[PDB]
Amino acid sequence: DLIVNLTDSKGTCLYAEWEMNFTITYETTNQTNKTITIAVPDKATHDGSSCNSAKIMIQFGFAVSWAVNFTKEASHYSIHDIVLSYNTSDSTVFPGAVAKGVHTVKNPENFKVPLDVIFKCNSVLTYNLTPVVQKYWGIHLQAFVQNGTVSKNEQVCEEDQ
Numbered sequence: 001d002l003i004v005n006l007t008d009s010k011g012t013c014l015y016a017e018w019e020m021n022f023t024i025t026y027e028t029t030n031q032t033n034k035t036i037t038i039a040v041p042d043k044a045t046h047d048g049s050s051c052n053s054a055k056i057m058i059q060f061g062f063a064v065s066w067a068v069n070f071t072k073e074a075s076h077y078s079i080h081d082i083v084l085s086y087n088t089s090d091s092t093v094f095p096g097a098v099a100k101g102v103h104t105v106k107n108p109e110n111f112k113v114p115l116d117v118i119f120k121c122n123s124v125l126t127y128n129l130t131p132v133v134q135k136y137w138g139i140h141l142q143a144f145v146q147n148g149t150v151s152k153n154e155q156v157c158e159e160d161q
């Protein structure tokens, strides 16, 4: 139940509510592969998150970090540069991994959301980024919150129709 509620001295400047998990395939011994799913729980930290161009950063243990960009007035703010980094030297989640160190998968998505609204999509957005399947859902989002108060006006993703 990921919640990132960033505030300044005038109120909330960024609100994010969502759920995500990552299905990762990595190489294992004797020329094999292992596929695992990591559900990001809450216990995970949001260090580095900030309200130019407000970002969210999520860390979970040794293994996985995740980040996203919000850039204002690319018409009128873009959700961009979604990046997942995972560390296969962590036996805790990647047991039997051949490769060591960090791997990074980039998401080409560049999504558009109006200002002064809250973006809502409780539905599952799936991005197939081999070797990683990213799933996002239960999303309530507003970057660049004005007057310290989250908007009451909703923009709903098409998947919710």
Ligand SMILES: *[C@@H]1O[C@H](CO)[C@@H](O)[C@H](O)[C@H]1NC(C)=O
Binding pocket: 005, 007, 012, 015, 150
């Ligand atoms: C976010 O935090 C502020 C201050 O901590 C609080 O007033 C508000 O209810 C929280 N939730 C939002 C803005 O959705």
Ligand SMILES: *[C@@H]1O[C@H](CO)[C@@H](O)[C@H](O)[C@H]1NC(C)=O
Binding pocket: 021, 037, 038, 039, 124, 135, 137
């Ligand atoms: C990952 O998310 C999808 C979509 O919400 C869900 O169907 C699946 O059960 C989740 N996997 C785990 C291990 O929680």
Ligand SMILES: *[C@@H]1O[C@H](CO)[C@@H](O)[C@H](O)[C@H]1NC(C)=O
Binding pocket: 025, 026, 027, 028, 030, 031, 032, 033, 034, 131
């Ligand atoms: C699967 O394993 C092969 C070798 O068996 C390796 O070359 C390949 O990179 C692995 N793929 C993934 C997604 O782990």
Ligand SMILES: *[C@@H]1O[C@H](CO)[C@@H](O)[C@H](O)[C@H]1NC(C)=O
Binding pocket: 053, 055, 067, 068, 069, 071, 081
């Ligand atoms: C996207 O975020 C990265 C850091 O994660 C930052 O360096 C970059 O400037 C951001 N994108 C834009 C268009 O500013």
Ligand SMILES: *[C@@H]1O[C@H](CO)[C@@H](O)[C@H](O)[C@H]1NC(C)=O
Binding pocket: 062, 087, 088, 089, 090, 101, 102
């Ligand atoms: C990856 O994990 C291993 C073991 O947990 C650790 O030695 C290494 O420093 C980690 N790398 C990063 C960039 O966190």
Ligand SMILES: [Zn+2]
Binding pocket: 001, 019, 138
């Ligand atoms: Zn849930």
Ligand SMILES: [Zn+2]
Binding pocket: 017, 140
């Ligand atoms: Zn809510």
Ligand SMILES: [Zn+2]
Binding pocket: 046
């Ligand atoms: Zn905090």
Ligand SMILES: [Zn+2]
Binding pocket: 061, 062, 063, 090, 091, 092, 093
């Ligand atoms: Zn670990």
Ligand SMILES: [Zn+2]
Binding pocket: 099, 102, 103, 104
């Ligand atoms: Zn890799």
Ligand SMILES: [Zn+2]
Binding pocket: none
């Ligand atoms: Zn590539």
Ligand SMILES: [Zn+2]
Binding pocket: none
């Ligand atoms: Zn009205």
Ligand SMILES: [Zn+2]
Binding pocket: none
């Ligand atoms: Zn449906």
